[PDB]
Amino acid sequence: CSLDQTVAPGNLTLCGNATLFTTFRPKARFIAPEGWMNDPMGLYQRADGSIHAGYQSHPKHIQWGNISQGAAYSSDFTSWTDFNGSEGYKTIWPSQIYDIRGVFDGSIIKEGIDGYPTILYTSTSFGPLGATLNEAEGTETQSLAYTTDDGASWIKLGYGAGQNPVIYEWPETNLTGFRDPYVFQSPRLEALLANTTSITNATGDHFATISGGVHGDGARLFLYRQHTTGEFIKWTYLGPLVTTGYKESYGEWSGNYGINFETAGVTRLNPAGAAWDNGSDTTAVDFVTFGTEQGRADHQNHWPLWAAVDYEVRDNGSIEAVIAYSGVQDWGRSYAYASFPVEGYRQVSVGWIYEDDDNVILAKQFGYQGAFTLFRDLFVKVVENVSPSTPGLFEQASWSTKNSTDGMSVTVTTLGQRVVPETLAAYKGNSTVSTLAPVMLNESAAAYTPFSSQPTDRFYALTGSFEFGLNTTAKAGFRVLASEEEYTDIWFDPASENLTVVRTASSLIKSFGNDTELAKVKLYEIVGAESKTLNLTVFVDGSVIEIYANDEVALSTRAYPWLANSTGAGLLADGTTAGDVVGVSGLELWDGLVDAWPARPANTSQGLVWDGPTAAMYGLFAGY
Amino acid sequence: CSLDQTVAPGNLTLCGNATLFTTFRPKARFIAPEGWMNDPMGLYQRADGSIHAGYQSHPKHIQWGNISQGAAYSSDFTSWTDFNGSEGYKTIWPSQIYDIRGVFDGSIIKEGIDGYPTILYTSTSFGPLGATLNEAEGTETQSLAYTTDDGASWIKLGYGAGQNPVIYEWPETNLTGFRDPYVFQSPRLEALLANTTSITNATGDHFATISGGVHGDGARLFLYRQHTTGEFIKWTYLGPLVTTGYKESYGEWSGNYGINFETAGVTRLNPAGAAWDNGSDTTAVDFVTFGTEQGRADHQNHWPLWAAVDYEVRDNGSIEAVIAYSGVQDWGRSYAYASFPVEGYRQVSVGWIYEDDDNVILAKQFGYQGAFTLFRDLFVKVVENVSPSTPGLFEQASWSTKNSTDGMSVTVTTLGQRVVPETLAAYKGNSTVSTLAPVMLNESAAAYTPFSSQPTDRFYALTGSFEFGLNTTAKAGFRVLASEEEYTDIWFDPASENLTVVRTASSLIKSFGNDTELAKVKLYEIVGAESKTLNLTVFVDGSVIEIYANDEVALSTRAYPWLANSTGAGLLADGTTAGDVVGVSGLELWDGLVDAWPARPANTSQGLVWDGPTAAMYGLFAGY
Ligand SMILES: *[C@@H]1O[C@H](CO)[C@@H](O[C@@H]2O[C@H](CO)[C@@H](O[C@@H]3O[C@H](CO[C@H]4O[C@H](CO[C@H]5O[C@H](CO)[C@@H](O)[C@H](O)[C@@H]5O[C@H]5O[C@H](CO)[C@@H](O)[C@H](O)[C@@H]5O)[C@@H](O)[C@H](O[C@H]5O[C@H](CO)[C@@H](O)[C@H](O)[C@@H]5O)[C@@H]4O)[C@@H](O)[C@H](O[C@H]4O[C@H](CO)[C@@H](O)[C@H](O)[C@@H]4O[C@H]4O[C@H](CO)[C@@H](O)[C@H](O)[C@@H]4O[C@H]4O[C@H](CO)[C@@H](O)[C@H](O)[C@@H]4O)[C@@H]3O)[C@H](O)[C@H]2NC(C)=O)[C@H](O)[C@H]1NC(C)=O
Ligand SMILES: *[C@@H]1O[C@H](CO)[C@@H](O[C@@H]2O[C@H](CO)[C@@H](O[C@@H]3O[C@H](CO[C@H]4O[C@H](CO[C@H]5O[C@H](CO)[C@@H](O)[C@H](O)[C@@H]5O[C@H]5O[C@H](CO)[C@@H](O)[C@H](O)[C@@H]5O)[C@@H](O)[C@H](O[C@H]5O[C@H](CO)[C@@H](O)[C@H](O)[C@@H]5O)[C@@H]4O)[C@@H](O)[C@H](O[C@H]4O[C@H](CO)[C@@H](O)[C@H](O)[C@@H]4O[C@H]4O[C@H](CO)[C@@H](O)[C@H](O)[C@@H]4O[C@H]4O[C@H](CO)[C@@H](O)[C@H](O)[C@@H]4O)[C@@H]3O)[C@H](O)[C@H]2NC(C)=O)[C@H](O)[C@H]1NC(C)=O
Ligand SMILES: *[C@@H]1O[C@H](CO)[C@@H](O[C@@H]2O[C@H](CO)[C@@H](O[C@@H]3O[C@H](CO[C@H]4O[C@H](CO)[C@@H](O)[C@H](O[C@H]5O[C@H](CO)[C@@H](O)[C@H](O)[C@@H]5O)[C@@H]4O)[C@@H](O)[C@H](O[C@H]4O[C@H](CO)[C@@H](O)[C@H](O)[C@@H]4O[C@H]4O[C@H](CO)[C@@H](O)[C@H](O)[C@@H]4O)[C@@H]3O)[C@H](O)[C@H]2NC(C)=O)[C@H](O)[C@H]1NC(C)=O
Ligand SMILES: *[C@@H]1O[C@H](CO)[C@@H](O[C@@H]2O[C@H](CO)[C@@H](O[C@@H]3O[C@H](CO[C@H]4O[C@H](CO)[C@@H](O)[C@H](O[C@H]5O[C@H](CO)[C@@H](O)[C@H](O)[C@@H]5O)[C@@H]4O)[C@@H](O)[C@H](O[C@H]4O[C@H](CO)[C@@H](O)[C@H](O)[C@@H]4O[C@H]4O[C@H](CO)[C@@H](O)[C@H](O)[C@@H]4O)[C@@H]3O)[C@H](O)[C@H]2NC(C)=O)[C@H](O)[C@H]1NC(C)=O
Ligand SMILES: *[C@@H]1O[C@H](CO)[C@@H](O)[C@H](O)[C@H]1NC(C)=O
Ligand SMILES: *[C@@H]1O[C@H](CO)[C@@H](O)[C@H](O)[C@H]1NC(C)=O
Ligand SMILES: *[C@@H]1O[C@H](CO)[C@@H](O)[C@H](O)[C@H]1NC(C)=O
Ligand SMILES: *[C@@H]1O[C@H](CO)[C@@H](O)[C@H](O)[C@H]1NC(C)=O
Ligand SMILES: *[C@@H]1O[C@H](CO)[C@@H](O)[C@H](O)[C@H]1NC(C)=O
Ligand SMILES: *[C@@H]1O[C@H](CO)[C@@H](O)[C@H](O)[C@H]1NC(C)=O
Ligand SMILES: *[C@@H]1O[C@H](CO)[C@@H](O)[C@H](O)[C@H]1NC(C)=O
Ligand SMILES: *[C@@H]1O[C@H](CO)[C@@H](O)[C@H](O)[C@H]1NC(C)=O
Ligand SMILES: *[C@@H]1O[C@H](CO)[C@@H](O)[C@H](O)[C@H]1NC(C)=O
Ligand SMILES: *[C@@H]1O[C@H](CO)[C@@H](O)[C@H](O)[C@H]1NC(C)=O
Ligand SMILES: O=C1C=CC(=O)C=C1
Ligand SMILES: O=C1C=CC(=O)C=C1
Ligand SMILES: O=C1C=CC(=O)C=C1
Ligand SMILES: O=C1C=CC(=O)C=C1
Ligand SMILES: O=C1C=CC(=O)C=C1
Ligand SMILES: O=C1C=CC(=O)C=C1
Ligand SMILES: O=C1C=CC(=O)C=C1
Ligand SMILES: O=C1C=CC(=O)C=C1
Ligand SMILES: O=C1C=CC(=O)C=C1
Ligand SMILES: O=C1C=CC(=O)C=C1
Ligand SMILES: O=C1C=CC(=O)C=C1
């Protein structure tokens, strides 16, 4: 096993455990110290203003199993500190008959048991578990734990009658899943249900959704309401909040609703961030975010989606969330977005970026799998003075349109996502910033033009504004992680409305994914404008490439170039001419970003272990 | 619910939880503070000379489940102290995927991991578990834990490859069971295997048996040997030690070998107690003790048996234990005898006495189930100068015979059992002792003659020697727990060789068992004697009646008289005449015995709990 990154890669499958630990590893984002991680969980702003972030964790393994909550905290979403207790960085683990198969996702009641922060989590036990298997009641239940030390440790309620698990009866028969409880307060839902509380006797100030579906009949989000304020044992099932069809699709802009929902949440946003009104704010919009499974041929059969909804009150004192329009939270190799409230009327979302090693060829050599996305402020994105001649504008697929009185302009509303400003400020301030001269891409543009300043390593951000003619057939974008022999190409093609990441040349290592990523981007043309603009921000962090367009479209993916000098970046141009010119301005390179884990050494591997021959006898976990 | 014990019992099923806690409860023996208990486990003499006793425990429940080790210690087998830690009197509990279904029986390696006392125990996980079900590999494994604080707490080895569980592969296919590991040293087996250790490479100084059987083909005791001295991970399967047929019986004196063995152990005894020779002591005998299941119509389908064995070395470097003769450890409502070495060349055995409430009608009102037997010294019982005219003597059923040179007398060898002397000394010393005048039971004997001194409560011992003509048809014995309307009759009938406990009148409460108990007793007639003698000792302790005959035959049973004055005792006589006289001598009453748990108040109930609706979903435990 040679680690010589100045020559072609050898047979890296011969390398020892964690020998490639630092080679591709993100340094500027949330990631476990080592081993397997997946979904964010247990997210809350603590009383001291810091952020507590949990995550699905399997230390010293590179596949899922014994799933536990790993945890850390930060004052700025950007620089993190691990918890360190009797179980290292874990703070909740399988320990009881009701959760021995795994401590799945959960969410926080900020003032719960005895006034302490409280997690409601999916406690799993034995039996077939999955949307494509014949799951039975009891395999997935919902349980409580609380913390008296701000997340350093959690105390589970006792096992038994009137204690854990607190939710165990299936609300409908033949579920595909019953997990990922999302607890939230909602002045809006309280106001809508206030006339019906005699029907259900549920009058608490917390709601919870549970994610799942019904065999042969599509996904379901189930809505519960806390039976009594200040009491956390009894949760009353109201009814299904979101009902979608078996592999139903709202279309090209909206992914596919698959057969089962995972990690669903409910929020209410306005142009500034989180909205806490009862329905009185005419600028606020109700949103559901949710993962779907088995409605996609690739990306692990997983869509991370969102929908704007209009609530209707049913005669049985429940809520129907009718989908108004429906979009995609991230078009790439990410899933399991969680959102949580943050002081200053913010709703912050973060997801998991999986690797692109689906055959598990170099996972042991890495010694880890998975990272988070960046933390994103959610808000209602409003575009004013939109031209009615914007192609496809009135399909209203993943946006709403509202005509002016005179019908000559349109207000566009959609979900906005932007990186939290604390992270952008820390990244810029710690980086070597190069402000680049604006560039017209015309008949003289090479296919690839390196920037006048180059990154020094695999940790940088790029920004640019790409101005196109209304009738362009030109393509432009960014090349990143680039040498002569390895590179990753980020293209926008306004004529097709497609943002692509071409990875045919991303790496000389053949075992990593090399499929083209694709997002749809609608350029809302402005009344009076003779051009249309793409604002593109790209984060490069080890192997992560995380793309943001127009504070709306996000695409996370992975690139694993072998060569030490595959770090370069620049502009891409295709079909640019004297007539079809792409104007590039606001160009900046941030070289270096931030060390997100300053207390951690470069190599936090503790080695890998095998569960031994019993792993196959129990049949629950891969065992490695 | 009336607790008036001066009138007929009402409908006691209306009484609250633990309202009958003190009514029938033993006070002079080992019993859990409250709730469910079954098999003794983890028995060892600690370095300070005290006895550590574990037991299968389910606190705050009256049925089996979440089975754990409860524990206590004693300097004299008689007066006990509970451990008290984070889990109350428990010291091992389900906590890992490999043992979450229960911490079953286990036994002690006195100098184990890092030199500490170490338990090898059956760690159970999910799946069908039972001799009549289709069990699969992994459901029952064998795991290690060690104690750095003399049994106050136990540390399990980690889960995984080269750690727990340490024994998981089934040594043969289609097992009925795979549990109750019994660890022992054996100079005898080491000497027998010393010429074969090149075949198996197993050279350690500890052996272990695992109890089970093969579907359709009878019980098996599997023999393992520690692979290397001082190392406790690797145990090498040698082969089956004991192989019996599907519901095979050696006869009327020997119970039935059923379909599956439980709680089996291996020892070597001589006339004085434990034998540590390599085979050189011609007076020593190899013994196996074992429970069998599904070879009995009653007593919970359970026989506690023992056999004398002759070891043969197989060509594959394993041991066959050939049964020489085969007997019964206790003929009553007891099971799961464990034996362990004690300083002074002793082997001490103790079992579990279950209740006689098999339909669980008053278990909640009790607030507990189960007790131990008394602690018994095992030894080789040798009877010299036995007359060859002793009826049935040469069947050699549960004994061996050796003729004198001249063929006119016989030495009889069998398993001896006697109560440990520490308990007899403490009982006698703390009691009001009444030495009773000898009685000839003749034509003038009433059916029942109360003793000249009477017990004051349900805690007493009786002893007597009953001398019969060689051709008697008379019956005699003891009546205990007796008023005019409730009583329990203990009869011996030499003509049938039957010791019976008649319980038709034991209680006015109809829901308790009232079936007649039966043991076989061989009176070895001595050369020159014109009579034969039964030495009978009876312990009455709450509801326990524990009978010992001739330091050989034991019979544990239960009686639950309601009336406060059902405490009396005396002599029984049937068919005694001027010609057929039963001489009764050495009569003594020990009134009071000892308070075995001086630190405990009379009512140690903590209430009962229900596991709730998930108990039926998991399907592992009753839930109460
Ligand atoms: C199979 O058997 C299993 C084993 O028995 C069983 O699991 C056990 O279940 C029991 C019952 O549910 C659990 O017991 C609960 O424990 C909770 C505390 O749990 C935390 O702490 C314990 C103890 O921690 C000590 O010991 C450890 C180990 O040594 C140390 O590491 C600690 O530092 C600490 O040490 C100090 O204290 C020791 C003595 O205890 C000293 O010896 C020592 O020197 C130290 O000074 C830990 O063991 C726990 O860890 C385990 O669990 C966590 C997850 O929680 C895991 O991550 C971890 O790996 C372990 O598995 C844990 O950290 C108790 O709070 C709880 O007691 C409350 O509830 C019960 C009712 O259920 C009440 O009766 C009781 O009064 C308490 O209620 C009051 O208190 C709370 C808040 O304090 C209130 O909300 C509540 O309303 C109530 O208030 C009362 O008082 C009020 C004011 O005073 C008043 O106003 C009210 O009116 C009211 O009266 C309970 O004891 C036990 O932890 C489980 N153990 C394990 C190992 O899992 C399992 O379930 C069984 N399974 C089945 C299928 O049956
Ligand atoms: C799913 O995830 C689960 C959770 O992660 C996982 O379970 C966990 O498994 C891990 C890995 O097996 C277990 O970790 C082991 O822990 C053993 C100790 O266990 C006892 O103590 C812990 C810790 O106790 C502290 O904290 C608790 C809780 O707060 C307190 O109550 C205690 O008082 C104590 O507190 C002090 O210390 C704290 C910091 O730790 C401080 O914060 C605190 O302030 C205090 O001062 C308890 O939690 C355990 O309780 C749990 O387990 C018991 C049963 O054991 C239950 O009854 C209970 O309910 C709980 O469930 C328990 O009491 C360690 O000994 C062990 O470390 C040894 O082994 C590993 C290898 O496996 C080595 O890497 C390591 O070096 C150690 O080996 C050395 O030491 C031993 C002897 O000391 C030697 O025999 C050995 O050879 C070696 O020697 C070394 O040194 C020699 C000389 O120095 C040298 O010569 C040698 O060469 C060599 O180097 C390991 O850490 C963990 O306990 C499990 N946790 C739980 C909650 O279950 C589960 O398996 C997963 N499941 C699956 C399917 O994957
Ligand atoms: C005395 O100790 C007991 C513990 O033993 C404590 O707890 C009680 O324990 C008993 C079992 O011993 C429980 O009984 C069972 O209850 C089931 C239905 O219960 C629901 O209704 C009652 C009101 O009438 C409520 O009290 C319960 O509330 C509690 O549980 C809920 C969760 O549901 C919590 O949220 C609450 O906070 C409470 O803690 C329940 O809502 C019932 O299904 C079950 O029935 C079986 O057993 C009986 C008797 O043998 C049969 O008649 C019946 O047919 C059922 O038999 C099943 O088993 C057979 C074979 O044996 C199968 O063939 C069938 O499939 C069948 O299903 C049982 O009655 C009791 O609920 C529980 N009470 C609690 C927790 O409060 C007592 O509290 C304690 N007393 C005191 C004062 O401390
Ligand atoms: C680097 O990290 C790893 C942890 O990932 C550490 O541990 C190793 O982990 C791997 C898995 O990653 C283990 O590999 C598996 O080994 C199985 C057979 O192992 C036995 O033989 C070897 C010697 O050749 C021994 O080393 C083992 O000893 C250990 O375990 C025993 C218990 O058995 C303990 O008592 C010891 O003390 C040791 O701790 C074993 O005795 C093997 O069955 C398994 O095979 C599957 O996977 C491979 C590769 O993918 C396939 O080729 C193969 O076909 C098997 O595929 C299964 O799965 C497919 C589908 O995927 C199914 O269709 C089939 O049914 C099939 O069964 C695998 O190779 C390895 O044993 C383990 N080593 C240990 C613990 O020492 C490393 O230690 C660590 N390295 C360092 C230096 O730290
Ligand atoms: C980068 O590395 C490769 C291999 O060492 C080398 O061939 C090439 O000239 C270097 N520079 C580039 C591609 O910019
Ligand atoms: C990282 O640390 C682990 C654990 O000590 C070690 O096995 C591995 O070889 C190291 N990897 C690198 C890149 O240094
Ligand atoms: C309320 O009605 C809805 C719509 O029919 C139904 O799906 C749901 O189960 C009902 N809620 C109940 C029965 O609690
Ligand atoms: C919105 O405006 C467009 C362009 O003026 C027009 O075609 C359409 O009919 C309008 N919709 C409504 C509801 O007025
Ligand atoms: C560098 O990053 C840290 C960690 O996020 C941040 O607090 C600090 O303000 C940054 N430095 C700047 C912007 O100068
Ligand atoms: C004992 O109690 C019963 C019921 O109170 C009474 O009838 C009887 O005379 C008393 N004495 C006896 C049976 O010795
Ligand atoms: C024993 O104590 C328990 C628990 O406090 C109580 O419920 C029960 O009624 C008491 N029983 C008696 C006989 O006093
Ligand atoms: C040794 O031989 C016995 C008798 O045939 C057999 O039952 C046992 O399995 C053998 N031991 C092995 C294969 O380890
Ligand atoms: C043992 O003694 C009895 C009575 O003398 C006799 O019948 C029998 O044959 C003897 N057995 C042997 C082996 O000598
Ligand atoms: C009474 O019992 C205790 C507890 O077993 C024992 O130590 C003591 O010696 C006994 N008293 C006597 C025999 O006088
Ligand atoms: O495969 C299936 C499992 C369960 C069910 O309800 C329908 C189909
Ligand atoms: O769906 C998939 C999940 C994980 C993996 O390794 C490959 C495919
Ligand atoms: O450079 C490249 C070579 C071959 C291919 O198919 C894509 C890119
Ligand atoms: O109108 C415009 C068209 C294209 C371009 O590059 C800039 C402006
Ligand atoms: O948080 C930390 C995790 C691991 C390590 O080695 C140092 C710090
Ligand atoms: O859980 C499992 C682990 C390993 C294997 O081979 C099959 C199932
Ligand atoms: O019932 C049965 C279960 C298992 C087996 O091997 C034979 C019979
Ligand atoms: O076999 C049996 C065991 C327990 C019980 O309650 C009744 C019968
Ligand atoms: O006293 C008794 C009454 C009836 C019976 O069958 C047995 C004893
Ligand atoms: O020989 C004897 C027969 C009977 C009896 O009671 C005493 C002596
Ligand atoms: O050992 C003891 C158990 C229980 C109790 O209450 C007092 C002492």
Ligand SMILES: O=C1C=CC(=O)C=C1
């Ligand atoms: O384990 C079980 C508990 C209760 C029940 O009704 C069925 C099974």
